[PDB]
mmCIF file of N, CA, C and O in Angstrom:
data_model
loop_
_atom_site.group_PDB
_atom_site.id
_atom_site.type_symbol
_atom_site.label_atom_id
_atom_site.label_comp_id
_atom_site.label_asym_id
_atom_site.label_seq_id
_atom_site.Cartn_x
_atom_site.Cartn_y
_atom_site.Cartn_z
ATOM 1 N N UNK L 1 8.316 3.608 1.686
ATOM 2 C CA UNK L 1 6.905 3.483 2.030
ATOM 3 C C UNK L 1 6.033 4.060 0.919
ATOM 4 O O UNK L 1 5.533 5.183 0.997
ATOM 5 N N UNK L 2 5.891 3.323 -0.011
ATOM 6 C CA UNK L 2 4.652 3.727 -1.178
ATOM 7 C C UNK L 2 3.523 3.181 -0.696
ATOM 8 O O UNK L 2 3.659 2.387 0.235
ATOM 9 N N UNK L 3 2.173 3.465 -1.197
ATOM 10 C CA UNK L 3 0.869 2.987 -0.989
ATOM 11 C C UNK L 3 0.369 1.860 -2.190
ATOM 12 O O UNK L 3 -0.178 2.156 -3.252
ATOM 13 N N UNK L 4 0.683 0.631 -1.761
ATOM 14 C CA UNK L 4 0.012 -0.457 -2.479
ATOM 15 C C UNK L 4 -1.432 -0.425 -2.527
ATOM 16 O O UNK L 4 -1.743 -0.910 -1.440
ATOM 17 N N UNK L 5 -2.381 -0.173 -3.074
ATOM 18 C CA UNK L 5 -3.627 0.488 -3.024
ATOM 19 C C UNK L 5 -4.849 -1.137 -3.505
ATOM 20 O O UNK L 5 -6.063 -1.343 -3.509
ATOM 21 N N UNK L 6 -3.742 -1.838 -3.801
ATOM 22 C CA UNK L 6 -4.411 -3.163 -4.320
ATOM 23 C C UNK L 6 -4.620 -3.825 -3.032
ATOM 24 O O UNK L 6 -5.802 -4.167 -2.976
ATOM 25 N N UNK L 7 -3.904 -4.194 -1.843
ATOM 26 C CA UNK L 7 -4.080 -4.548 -0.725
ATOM 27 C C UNK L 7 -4.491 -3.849 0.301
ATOM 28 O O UNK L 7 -5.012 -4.378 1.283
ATOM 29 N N UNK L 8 -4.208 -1.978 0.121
ATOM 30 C CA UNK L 8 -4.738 -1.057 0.331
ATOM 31 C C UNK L 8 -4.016 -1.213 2.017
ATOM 32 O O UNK L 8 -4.704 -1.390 3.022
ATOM 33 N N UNK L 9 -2.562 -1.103 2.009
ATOM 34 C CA UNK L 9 -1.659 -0.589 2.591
ATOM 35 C C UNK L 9 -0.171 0.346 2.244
ATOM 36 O O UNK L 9 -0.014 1.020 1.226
ATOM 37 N N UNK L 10 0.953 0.168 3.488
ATOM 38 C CA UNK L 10 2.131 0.889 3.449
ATOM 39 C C UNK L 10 2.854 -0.271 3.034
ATOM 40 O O UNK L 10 2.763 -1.307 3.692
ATOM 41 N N UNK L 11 3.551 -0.202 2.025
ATOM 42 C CA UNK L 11 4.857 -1.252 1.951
ATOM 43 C C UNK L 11 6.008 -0.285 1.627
ATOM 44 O O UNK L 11 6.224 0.570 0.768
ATOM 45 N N UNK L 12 6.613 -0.761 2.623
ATOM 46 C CA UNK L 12 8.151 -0.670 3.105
ATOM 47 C C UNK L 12 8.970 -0.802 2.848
ATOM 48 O O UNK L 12 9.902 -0.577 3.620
#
């Protein structure tokens, strides 16, 4: 779970 900050969620 890092923070994709471009879509500005959790990916898994």
């Amino acid at each position: 779970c890092h923070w994709d900050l471009l879509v500005r969620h959790w990916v898994c």
